[PDB]
Amino acid sequence: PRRKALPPRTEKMAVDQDWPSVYPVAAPFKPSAVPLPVRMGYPVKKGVPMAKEGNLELLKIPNFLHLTPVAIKKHCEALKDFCTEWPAALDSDEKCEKHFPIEIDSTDYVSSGPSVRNPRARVVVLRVKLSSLNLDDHAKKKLIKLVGERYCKTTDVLTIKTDRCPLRRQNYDYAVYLLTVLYHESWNTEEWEKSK
Amino acid sequence: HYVDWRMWRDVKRRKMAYEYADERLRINSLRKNTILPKILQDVADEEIAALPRDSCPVRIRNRCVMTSRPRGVKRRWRLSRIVFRHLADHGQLSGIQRATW
Amino acid sequence: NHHTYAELMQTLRFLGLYRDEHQDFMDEQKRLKKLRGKEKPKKGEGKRA
Amino acid sequence: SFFTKLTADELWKGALAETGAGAKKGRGKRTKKKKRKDLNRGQIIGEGRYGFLWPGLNVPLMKNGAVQTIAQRSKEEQEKVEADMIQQREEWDRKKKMKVKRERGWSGNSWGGISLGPPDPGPCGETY
Amino acid sequence: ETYTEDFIKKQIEEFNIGKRHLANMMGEDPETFTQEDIDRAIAYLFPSGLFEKRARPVMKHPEQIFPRQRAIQWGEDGRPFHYLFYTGKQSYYSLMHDVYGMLLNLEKHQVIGSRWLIKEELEEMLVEKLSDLDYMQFIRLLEKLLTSQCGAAEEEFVQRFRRSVTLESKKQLIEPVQYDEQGMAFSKSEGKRKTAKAEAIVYKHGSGRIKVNGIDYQLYFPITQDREQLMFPFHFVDRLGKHDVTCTVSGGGRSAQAGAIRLAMAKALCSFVTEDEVEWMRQAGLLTTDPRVRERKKPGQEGARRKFTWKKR
Amino acid sequence: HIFLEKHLESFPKQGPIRHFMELVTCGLSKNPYLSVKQKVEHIEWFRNYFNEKKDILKESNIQFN
Amino acid sequence: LGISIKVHEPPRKIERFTLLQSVHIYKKHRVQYEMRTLYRCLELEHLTGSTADVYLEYIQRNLPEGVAMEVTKTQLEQLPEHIKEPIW
Amino acid sequence: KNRAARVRVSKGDKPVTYEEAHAPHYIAHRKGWLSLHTGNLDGEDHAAERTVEDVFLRKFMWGTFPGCLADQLVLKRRGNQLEICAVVLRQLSPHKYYFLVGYSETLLSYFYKCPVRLHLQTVPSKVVYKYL
Amino acid sequence: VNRDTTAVPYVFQDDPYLMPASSLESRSFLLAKKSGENVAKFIINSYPKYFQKDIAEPHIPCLMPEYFEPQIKDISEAALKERIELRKVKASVDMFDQLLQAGTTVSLETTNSLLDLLCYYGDQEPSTDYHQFGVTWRAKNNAERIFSLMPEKNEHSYCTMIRGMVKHRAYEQALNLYTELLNNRLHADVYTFNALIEATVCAINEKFEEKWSKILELLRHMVAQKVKPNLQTFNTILKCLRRFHVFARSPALQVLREMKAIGIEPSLATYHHIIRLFDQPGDPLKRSSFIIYDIMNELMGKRFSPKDPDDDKFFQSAMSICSSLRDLELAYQVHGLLKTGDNWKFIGPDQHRNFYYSKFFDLICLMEQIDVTLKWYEDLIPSAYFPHSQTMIHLLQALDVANRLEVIPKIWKDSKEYGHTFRSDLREEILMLMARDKHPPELQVAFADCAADIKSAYESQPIRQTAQDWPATSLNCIAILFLRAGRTQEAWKMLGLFRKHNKIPRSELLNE
RNA sequence: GGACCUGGCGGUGCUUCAUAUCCCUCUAGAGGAGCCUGUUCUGUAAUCGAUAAACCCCGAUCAACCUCACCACCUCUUGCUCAGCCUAUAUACCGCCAUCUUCAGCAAACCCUGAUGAAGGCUACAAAGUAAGCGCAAGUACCCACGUAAAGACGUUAGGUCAAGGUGUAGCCCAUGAGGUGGCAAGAAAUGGGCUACAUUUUCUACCCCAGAAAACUACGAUAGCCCUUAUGAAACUUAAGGGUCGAAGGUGGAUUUAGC
Ligand SMILES: [K+]
Ligand SMILES: [K+]
Ligand SMILES: [K+]
Ligand SMILES: [K+]
Ligand SMILES: [K+]
Ligand SMILES: [K+]
Ligand SMILES: [K+]
Ligand SMILES: [Mg+2]
Ligand SMILES: [Mg+2]
Ligand SMILES: [Mg+2]
Ligand SMILES: [Mg+2]
Ligand SMILES: [Mg+2]
Ligand SMILES: [Mg+2]
Ligand SMILES: [Mg+2]
Ligand SMILES: [Mg+2]
Ligand SMILES: [Mg+2]
Ligand SMILES: [Mg+2]
Ligand SMILES: [Mg+2]
Ligand SMILES: [Mg+2]
Ligand SMILES: [Mg+2]
Ligand SMILES: [Mg+2]
Ligand SMILES: [Mg+2]
Ligand SMILES: [Mg+2]
Ligand SMILES: [Mg+2]
Ligand SMILES: [Mg+2]
Ligand SMILES: [Mg+2]
Ligand SMILES: [Mg+2]
Ligand SMILES: [Mg+2]
Numbered sequence A: 001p002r003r004k005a006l007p008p009r010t011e012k013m014a015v016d017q018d019w020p021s022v023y024p025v026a027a028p029f030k031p032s033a034v035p036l037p038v039r040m041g042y043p044v045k046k047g048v049p050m051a052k053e054g055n056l057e058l059l060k061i062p063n064f065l066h067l068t069p070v071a072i073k074k075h076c077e078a079l080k081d082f083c084t085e086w087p088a089a090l091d092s093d094e095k096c097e098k099h100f101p102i103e104i105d106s107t108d109y110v111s112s113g114p115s116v117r118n119p120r121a122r123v124v125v126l127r128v129k130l131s132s133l134n135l136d137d138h139a140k141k142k143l144i145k146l147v148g149e150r151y152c153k154t155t156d157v158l159t160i161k162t163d164r165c166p167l168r169r170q171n172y173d174y175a176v177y178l179l180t181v182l183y184h185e186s187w188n189t190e191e192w193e194k195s196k
Numbered sequence B: 001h002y003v004d005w006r007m008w009r010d011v012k013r014r015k016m017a018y019e020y021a022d023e024r025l026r027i028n029s030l031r032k033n034t035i036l037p038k039i040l041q042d043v044a045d046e047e048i049a050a051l052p053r054d055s056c057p058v059r060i061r062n063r064c065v066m067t068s069r070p071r072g073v074k075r076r077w078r079l080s081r082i083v084f085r086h087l088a089d090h091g092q093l094s095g096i097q098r099a100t101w
Numbered sequence C: 001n002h003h004t005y006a007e008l009m010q011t012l013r014f015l016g017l018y019r020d021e022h023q024d025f026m027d028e029q030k031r032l033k034k035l036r037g038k039e040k041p042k043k044g045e046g047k048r049a
Numbered sequence D: 001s002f003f004t005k006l007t008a009d010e011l012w013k014g015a016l017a018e019t020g021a022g023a024k025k026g027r028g029k030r031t032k033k034k035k036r037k038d039l040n041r042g043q044i045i046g047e048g049r050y051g052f053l054w055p056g057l058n059v060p061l062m063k064n065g066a067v068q069t070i071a072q073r074s075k076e077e078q079e080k081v082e083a084d085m086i087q088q089r090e091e092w093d094r095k096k097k098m099k100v101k102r103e104r105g106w107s108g109n110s111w112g113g114i115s116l117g118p119p120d121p122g123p124c125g126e127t128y
Numbered sequence E: 001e002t003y004t005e006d007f008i009k010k011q012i013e014e015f016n017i018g019k020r021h022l023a024n025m026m027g028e029d030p031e032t033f034t035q036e037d038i039d040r041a042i043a044y045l046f047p048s049g050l051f052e053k054r055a056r057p058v059m060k061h062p063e064q065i066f067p068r069q070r071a072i073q074w075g076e077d078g079r080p081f082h083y084l085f086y087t088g089k090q091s092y093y094s095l096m097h098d099v100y101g102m103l104l105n106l107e108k109h110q111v112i113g114s115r116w117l118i119k120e121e122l123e124e125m126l127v128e129k130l131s132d133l134d135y136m137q138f139i140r141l142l143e144k145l146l147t148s149q150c151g152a153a154e155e156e157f158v159q160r161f162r163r164s165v166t167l168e169s170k171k172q173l174i175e176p177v178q179y180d181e182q183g184m185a186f187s188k189s190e191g192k193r194k195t196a197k198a199e200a201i202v203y204k205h206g207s208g209r210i211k212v213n214g215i216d217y218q219l220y221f222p223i224t225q226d227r228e229q230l231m232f233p234f235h236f237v238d239r240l241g242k243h244d245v246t247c248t249v250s251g252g253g254r255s256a257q258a259g260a261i262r263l264a265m266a267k268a269l270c271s272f273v274t275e276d277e278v279e280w281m282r283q284a285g286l287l288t289t290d291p292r293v294r295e296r297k298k299p300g301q302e303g304a305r306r307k308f309t310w311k312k313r
Numbered sequence F: 001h002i003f004l005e006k007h008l009e010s011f012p013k014q015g016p017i018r019h020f021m022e023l024v025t026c027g028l029s030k031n032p033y034l035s036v037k038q039k040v041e042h043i044e045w046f047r048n049y050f051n052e053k054k055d056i057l058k059e060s061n062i063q064f065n
Numbered sequence G: 001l002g003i004s005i006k007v008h009e010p011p012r013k014i015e016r017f018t019l020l021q022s023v024h025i026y027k028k029h030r031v032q033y034e035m036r037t038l039y040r041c042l043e044l045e046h047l048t049g050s051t052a053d054v055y056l057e058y059i060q061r062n063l064p065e066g067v068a069m070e071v072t073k074t075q076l077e078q079l080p081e082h083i084k085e086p087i088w
Numbered sequence H: 001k002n003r004a005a006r007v008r009v010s011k012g013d014k015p016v017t018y019e020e021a022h023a024p025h026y027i028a029h030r031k032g033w034l035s036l037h038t039g040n041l042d043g044e045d046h047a048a049e050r051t052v053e054d055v056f057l058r059k060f061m062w063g064t065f066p067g068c069l070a071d072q073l074v075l076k077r078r079g080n081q082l083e084i085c086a087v088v089l090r091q092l093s094p095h096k097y098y099f100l101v102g103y104s105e106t107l108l109s110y111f112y113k114c115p116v117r118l119h120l121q122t123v124p125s126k127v128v129y130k131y132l
Numbered sequence I: 001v002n003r004d005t006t007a008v009p010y011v012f013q014d015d016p017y018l019m020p021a022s023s024l025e026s027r028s029f030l031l032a033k034k035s036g037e038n039v040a041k042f043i044i045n046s047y048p049k050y051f052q053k054d055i056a057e058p059h060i061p062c063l064m065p066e067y068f069e070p071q072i073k074d075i076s077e078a079a080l081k082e083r084i085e086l087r088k089v090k091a092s093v094d095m096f097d098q099l100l101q102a103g104t105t106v107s108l109e110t111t112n113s114l115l116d117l118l119c120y121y122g123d124q125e126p127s128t129d130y131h132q133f134g135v136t137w138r139a140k141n142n143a144e145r146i147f148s149l150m151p152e153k154n155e156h157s158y159c160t161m162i163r164g165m166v167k168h169r170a171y172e173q174a175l176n177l178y179t180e181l182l183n184n185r186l187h188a189d190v191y192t193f194n195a196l197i198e199a200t201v202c203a204i205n206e207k208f209e210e211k212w213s214k215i216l217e218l219l220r221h222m223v224a225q226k227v228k229p230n231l232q233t234f235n236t237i238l239k240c241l242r243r244f245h246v247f248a249r250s251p252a253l254q255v256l257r258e259m260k261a262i263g264i265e266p267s268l269a270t271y272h273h274i275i276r277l278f279d280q281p282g283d284p285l286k287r288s289s290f291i292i293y294d295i296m297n298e299l300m301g302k303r304f305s306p307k308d309p310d311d312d313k314f315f316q317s318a319m320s321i322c323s324s325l326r327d328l329e330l331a332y333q334v335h336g337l338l339k340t341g342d343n344w345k346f347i348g349p350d351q352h353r354n355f356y357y358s359k360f361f362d363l364i365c366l367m368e369q370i371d372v373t374l375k376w377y378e379d380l381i382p383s384a385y386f387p388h389s390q391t392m393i394h395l396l397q398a399l400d401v402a403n404r405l406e407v408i409p410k411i412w413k414d415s416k417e418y419g420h421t422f423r424s425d426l427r428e429e430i431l432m433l434m435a436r437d438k439h440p441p442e443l444q445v446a447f448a449d450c451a452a453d454i455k456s457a458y459e460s461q462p463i464r465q466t467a468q469d470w471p472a473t474s475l476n477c478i479a480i481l482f483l484r485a486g487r488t489q490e491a492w493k494m495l496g497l498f499r500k501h502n503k504i505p506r507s508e509l510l511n512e
Numbered sequence J: 001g002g003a004c005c006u007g008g009c010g011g012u013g014c015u016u017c018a019u020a021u022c023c024c025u026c027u028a029g030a031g032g033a034g035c036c037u038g039u040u041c042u043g044u045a046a047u048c049g050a051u052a053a054a055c056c057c058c059g060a061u062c063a064a065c066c067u068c069a070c071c072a073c074c075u076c077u078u079g080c081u082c083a084g085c086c087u088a089u090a091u092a093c094c095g096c097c098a099u100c101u102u103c104a105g106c107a108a109a110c111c112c113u114g115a116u117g118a119a120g121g122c123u124a125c126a127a128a129g130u131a132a133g134c135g136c137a138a139g140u141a142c143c144c145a146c147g148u149a150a151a152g153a154c155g156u157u158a159g160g161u162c163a164a165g166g167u168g169u170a171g172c173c174c175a176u177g178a179g180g181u182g183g184c185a186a187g188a189a190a191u192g193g194g195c196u197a198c199a200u201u202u203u204c205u206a207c208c209c210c211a212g213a214a215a216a217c218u219a220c221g222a223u224a225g226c227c228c229u230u231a232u233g234a235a236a237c238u239u240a241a242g243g244g245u246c247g248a249a250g251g252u253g254g255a256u257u258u259a260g261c
Helices: A069-082 A093-099 A137-150 A168-187 B005-019 B021-031 B038-049 B081-089 C002-014 C021-035 D008-016 D075-097 E005-025 E035-045 E090-109 E119-125 E132-146 E153-160 E224-236 E254-272 E275-283 F016-028 F036-052 F054-059 G049-061 H047-064 H094-112 I023-046 I077-085 I089-101 I108-121 I142-149 I155-167 I171-183 I190-202 I208-224 I231-240 I245-262 I268-278 I288-299 I309-325 I328-339 I350-367 I370-380 I389-402 I408-417 I424-434 I441-459 I472-485 I488-500 I507-511
Strands: A102-110 A124-129 A157-162 B096-098 E114-116 E162-164 E185-193 E196-203 E210-212 E245-250 G004-008 G013-020 G030-037 G041-045 G069-077 H074-078 H081-089 H116-123
Touching: A069 G049, A102 A168, A124 A168, A137 A157, A137 A168, A157 A168, B005 B021, B021 B038, B021 F036, B038 F054, B081 G013, C002 H047, C021 D008, E005 E035, E090 E132, E090 E153, E119 E132, E132 E153, E153 E162, E185 E254, E196 E254, E224 E254, E224 E275, E245 E254, E254 E275, F016 F036, F036 F054, G049 G069, H047 H074, H047 H081, H047 H094, H081 H094, H094 H116, H094 I023, I023 I350, I077 I089, I077 I108, I089 I108, I089 I142, I108 I142, I108 I155, I142 I155, I155 I171, I155 I190, I171 I190, I190 I208, I190 I231, I208 I231, I208 I245, I231 I245, I231 I268, I245 I268, I268 I288, I268 I309, I288 I309, I288 I328, I309 I328, I309 I350, I328 I350, I350 I370, I350 I389, I370 I389, I389 I408, I389 I424, I408 I424, I408 I441, I424 I441, I424 I472, I441 I472, I472 I488, I472 I507
Parallel strands: E210 E245, H081 H116
Antiparallel strands: A102 A124, A102 G069, A124 A157, B096 G030, E114 E162, E185 E196, E196 E245, G004 G041, G013 G030, H074 H081
């Protein structure tokens, strides 16, 4: 005799079970494992949406059965031990600017495929306010001319974008190097400057 | 095992162009300025002209990778319109649908 | 790499792990052309000699 | 090219030419039409030209209570398999050509006089 | 695909067990889990972006999902239950017989918010298929029943075949009257014309000043026709020189911007005029968003409508 | 990656060969697709190329080593 | 996890392109295709690097098939010590 | 008349699946996509490479499970994971399905240099949506 | 997350047609999947050029083909070391012979590296993908030939010869070689002594007192040579004393107390050997009772790490005594230790996992309340293991003792789902219990729906190829259940089967 | 040969209509000039296909080499391929389409009428039809319920495409296959589509709508010709861009004809 398929194990599931144990991680829809009479499909005339068994439309969906509200809350209770506490002193953005005047922007790109590489990820953007820097009248004027369009008068923020090095850590160190040589050259006074 | 002899010639052109890319880039740099002497640039002209013809990147043709069709190709997928539509019309190209507006 | 794909799947067919319906179709057409007398000649022994 | 290959259904639908302007109005004086043959009929998954024996696919997984290992049929042992498959294939062709003899009616090519059997049983279990 | 009573009974047992499973998945009380909660949970667990909602995952009660099926119309002996069975339309003709019988008894004794049900709704009350002329004949017979001195018993019957229709009032909505720091009453509205979008602030009291993106309206609109559009709402209600306006407009061209401001000012001006004046502005075309936008070009033709020249033959 | 003038010590300090190589290094310093190893290869190629062309350069009054 | 999060939906992008319908000739008959890219932007604020590693790993591992993520991180840094005072 | 991916009306005896019964204009309206990845989103790269891989896996699985596939493959990519979801018939012995799953997952993992998993859903017979 | 009790193990395909329905299918389905993986690896390694395109970033070293062939074709020392790393016994010997005939110098470290390869595999080639009883140390082998020809021999050279001989059961030769090492004023290592302890016991058959005096002499020699014993030294002593049983019971406990003092920590293997040594056939209550109770008080709440190859045998051994002693409180402590931390990974292979759970569940059904027994039945089967037909019977015997027979139809449904549809001992047991006594009409009807399905099982057996065999008890019970249910028509029809098969009718059936 | 059935057709009847649509009517065009581009002819050693509607900026969202399939010359023979062939056959086909369609019909299975002929099957105060399914419709996309897209069956034109790819049959196999070098791709002429114009509702400049000048042989008018420079490329009288020079036909276009609610 041919092999007879067993009945689906949904018939053994209790209505008060721990569902996260059934779908612990992302997995494709399994009719024999999902105890729901869910149907999908545009119905024919005087018909009904197709049943879940052999339903390709339900297989095409990126389901969230592994991310039920019950699961998310249990998952986050286990992930609290990995987190750190934000300093209470930094209550407002204005207080953050006072103590941490430099902002470093970087971007990570999550795509699907065999290669995790993305050339856009190397870019670094450094933003600082000239008010935060110890610049006298002469130095602030010279710094604005040197940076040109990188400085915005409305916001008083100097934006240095570095993307010429292969790596992000190199583009970060180069942005700091630029801020350092720009700061020290702004304080230096050459003899040709007298001809302003 | 490539689709046809014309795809096989383009495969070879892409391989040889890759091998000579640095050499051609360096020689061209000598020809693409007004700084170096003409006597030096005239020699560089002859040197880049003496390289194999199939090392020249303008001879590379973007053919359909499955059918080798030389025109009607969409660069993003490297497929001819006919092959692209076949996959798109069967719902096998992620996110691609018919446009109505 | 059309060489890799074609050579890999040809090898998998000879190993019995891949069924190439297209190749089987071509093999049956070539088999029936022998019985019909339309066989490929030997190189150098073509109809013109 | 591997990517230029099609399925058997596509290959037979094209090769047979059952649909076309020629079929529309019997535009051609044709008699013997090509008939599609199923090339997967006598084929066993796991069997290849090289004659490898894959445990769990084309040979039993366990032999004498132990798991079998990868093996390959000998050249002689594989020739027999190929010949046996050809003979099995020839039997399929031979039998299909062979036919039962229709009893004729008033003349050899006429339908008149030929029996069609009993009428079909009616919906309400009625029989003739 | 016929569905028997035993099949539906099993489908309802599955839906009730699955209803408790779905509630258990989402950590909600199974007892107070409604159909609105089911739809929300199914949309989260099985997100589908298909434009047609009927093709999306659904977990509905079997009664909602499966079509209505007529029960068997005869018993074991084969005798039909209804005396009009052999007409093939026993439910339709039983209704015509019942309405015709009531019309007879009356003789022996002697609109805005409602409509007649459509043929597809009658075809469900009866659970039969109807022709169009069958539907008309039935309606002609009900209308003939209203014209008579129908009593209470003859009125509950006619109301079964009447469906309440919710008329939507065309009365223009009025914006709230707000107050600024200085205590000046004003209203605010918005308008769209083509790709231009405008937002206008109309003050209850003023001298007739209009600022468009901070500029005097005659400097912003040097074309006299664009200024006539700004005049149109206030002139129509006799309020030229009585309100101050500060509006902002972006997108579109000069004419589309004047149209967007015209609509924004008219809507905001409705807060300071009488209800009868607001209906006159509506009837004058001052409160309707113009839906006329550029039509797309189609492939294979020169323009949105123009075709390529039909080549000489 | 960004400071490649240490690799031009073998080239002339003034003249056209210096001006040309300052453009090469300027372009290499802006290339994030090349490793330091590959950038030096470009520079070393020009150093050898100009050594073989000494006679031609002398005719033009340029002295490469 | 106690992280402050705001959400908004940037405007969608629809890229449309046209292709010939027939294999041969019939230029005036085309088939048009489109790719719809929809966006959701989660904006988290005032979180440490250790909290960002756990949250991003948790939500990146659960990124549905067909969904890409671009996470822009803005780091707070103090002035380099060399820049605090002029040498000159 | 349009032909692309349209199963044409017959005498009412041809069973079609839900995938087969919907022409291309129903894609994203009544039917979803058979592969989901990020290559066709705005600002994403490598769409050409994902497309070649998908065409191979469909041909590969057709010939690796000959006569067993009851519907089109559903291809899912998450990170570097590749999930192949197939609806198959219940004719082949379970031992052969386990052999071919182990064989296919391993062979495809080394071919595309990524962890590949194959998920099989078995049905007694091809699921019929309508008879055209 | 915890184990899903409605599911089979994660390694199987989650599909009702592909899920294993028996312990046999559970074993064979994994072997078929592993076979497919081997066929894939065989192809990948046979045709590596098809699998050399690396599109992964970061690189995945574990998804590239392996190259098992030497790529240095020169005849020199640096080319021999390659064939030794690849473990090519023949090629390395041939390369060593040719290298020697030419007269070139081969270093000592390399000569030893060749012995380690020959002495481990016994001058035989390791198993590859594709090209017990007795001693496997041949009289004339390449290892001995190379060893003799060796010009200079260091301590390591002898040690690898002594360990290899004992590994291949050349116990007598290894002791003879241990004498030369001492005559040459050399010092062996702990690993060599571990092998010599194995040889002292297995070399000859003698009384325990004779064997126990030699071992103590090796250990004292190990202290004279300033060699410190490791865990395997004590584990080999206890493993080798298994033969003597009662004689070694007190000597074996002297080894354990010594481990604690010295500072070596007993592993799971150390207690498995003590458990097996004390669990000799007989009455275990005298001694085995307090050895297992003391072993668990020590191991209570301890997480274990792999230290000895025999660590995966403690849990199988410990449960075996709890069943013998019929102590359910001890069994819970053994299972509790298996459930602390990651101790569940020491259960062992599939054969050890099924034996452990068979003895564990069979002890629950016997000594545990039926309400708790049915909770373990749901938690273990089929989630943890597939039951043998003898546990279904042990389960029915528990329902009988508890007077809960409304569950019998469920046990039959599960039995079929576990591959026991066509077991005779099981169908006879179920039918006898159902038809033993009369029951209320509601229960009697349920028993008749099960007997009918059992009747169908007897009719549609795979033995249908042979003539159908109906036991006498089965026919009597099936008929009686139909009568008591009111399905008299079915009972009257069955009477023909008493004459067809010539089975004696029971007195009770005739009276009813 | 007689009489019929069905279909087609009628410079066929009556009635009612068409809605950018048949006439009249409305607006801007084509048909005239130059130029751009396709095709036909002629020419060339020098492709192919489309080619009334439904070909003619058509396969091409694209030819300086390449592409390339053509011509001349030279070279290779188990050949990138468990060969190859853009060789014949689209009148063998799959595939994807044109066309009516700016249609609403197609039709299984039954039933009935005609004496049980080809055939035919409706009247609602109803007289033999019931009809699954397909299409229309409905839904969906775009900014609505509007509009526009999309959709649009069965068939029609053996309609288009063997040169997208695949493929039946036949044919080539030291060549009808593969490679290299160089070369053709022009204009007596005709014709289709388009572009720019003939100007004062214009031309130039500022501005982006309150201006100043120009305005008939130094006006309007070439995106053409000639010269130079630049860009791309290895390669440019040749392709593109810019500049200079040049300042022609054209003075609003017959019969006829296209598009738009
Ligand atoms: K007629
Ligand atoms: K004209
Ligand atoms: K024209
Ligand atoms: K065709
Ligand atoms: K073709
Ligand atoms: K052909
Ligand atoms: K002029
Ligand atoms: Mg090109
Ligand atoms: Mg003939
Ligand atoms: Mg005859
Ligand atoms: Mg226009
Ligand atoms: Mg069309
Ligand atoms: Mg018109
Ligand atoms: Mg003209
Ligand atoms: Mg031509
Ligand atoms: Mg032609
Ligand atoms: Mg033709
Ligand atoms: Mg050429
Ligand atoms: Mg050419
Ligand atoms: Mg040719
Ligand atoms: Mg045709
Ligand atoms: Mg609409
Ligand atoms: Mg359309
Ligand atoms: Mg429609
Ligand atoms: Mg034709
Ligand atoms: Mg040739
Ligand atoms: Mg010019
Ligand atoms: Mg140039």
